[PDB]
Symmetry: C2
């Protein structure tokens, strides 16, 4: 209702693997099932938007694409639109290619959207928004003074609602250059629970608290 856009910094993966004394890989892979579960739950709960802070480099981008071509099927099956934010220009044509395609393919779903922040940084997003305005100004730029609406509409998140609740798992209490502009009035939630241990139940408890705050 009042909660339309939930954003999450999924922290605690590698660390969750460490307490089980395991290699970094085990951790993230599990982190990936939570992501799936959490998104499906949000999809089935009338959330309008969920943004997740996704993140030798060529290799990571290999796994990403695999990751996306793999679950491509789960976006269609649960009616979930896909959107990527971040500096995609720094991607291999192949990844940028699969990214753009999953977007095309899912642009049909309008109820729930899952946004993945990839090679994402808020200061960088704002910098690119600025470059966007300098390179292609609004035609009436001359008659303008306040540019907030103009910036809002050039950010990677244009047309998504603002963030209502920004959650960070894993124990740390910092925004980490994530959706700074979009979370200007978001309710902030923090939990020590590591990401791979995070459940829809835990998220249900947090949402319950959210409503309590929202007098």
């Amino acid at each position: 209702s009042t909660l339309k856009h939930l954003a999450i910094i999924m922290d605690g993966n590698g660390r969750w693997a460490k307490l089980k004394n395991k290699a970094r890989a085990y951790g993230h892979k599990k982190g990936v099932k939570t992501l799936k579960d959490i998104t499906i739950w949000c999809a089935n709960h009338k959330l309008e938007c969920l943004t997740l802070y996704a993140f030798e480099v060529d290799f990571l981008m290999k796994m990403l694409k695999k990751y996306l071509k793999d679950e491509r099927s789960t976006y269609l099956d649960n009616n979930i639109r896909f959107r990527a934010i971040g500096d995609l220009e720094g991607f291999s044509k192949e990844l940028r290619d699969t990214i753009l395609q999953l977007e095309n393919d899912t642009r049909h779903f309008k109820d729930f959207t899952q946004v993945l922040a990839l090679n994402y940084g808020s200061k960088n997003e704002l910098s690119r928004a600025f470059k966007s305005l300098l390179e292609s100004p609004p035609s009436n730029i001359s008659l303008l003074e306040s540019l907030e609406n103009e910036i809002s509409n050039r950010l990677d998140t244009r047309n998504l609602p603002e963030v209502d609740l920004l959650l960070r798992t894993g124990g740390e209490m910092r925004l980490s250059n994530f959706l700074l502009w979009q979370s200007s009035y978001a309710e902030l939630f923090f939990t020590p629970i590591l990401w791979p241990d995070f459940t829809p139940k835990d998220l249900e408890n947090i949402i319950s608290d959210f409503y309590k705050r929202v007098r």
Copy 2:
């Protein structure tokens, strides 16, 4: 490593209603908290402290001018000053001029301030006269360090459009303590916690 502390001072009104006192009373108490915390930060060698109805502002600036001069506290205002009267805008500018020569610690008051508007003005400026660093250097906080610790008193847990860019990697603290009741000792407890967080991430 704590160089820039920023604080959202909230709870003055709620504090006055609890005490069945007039708002002005909660504001007067709040100004006393602001003064004590500012002096504490200067004595503890922070580089910068940023703090987030005009009646009280002109009075404060007039009455407190002497405390700045008497404690080597440089004063700077951030925010949209055009939205102020000639008189007020001039008094703010004059206090900055009166204290620009103090170079160790700066108290920054965010007046008619919002981050989105600050970024808007910086963007307008760059478009007009042409990246992260360029933007950073056109913000109102241009010659200050990034925020190391952003604290919000009063109980709410939201950034409220305050120093969003500058607090990108700041450690966030929240306390239910209402601003008029907040003391230097409370801040001392928060800062010991800050240093403990810093030890823990590297551990």
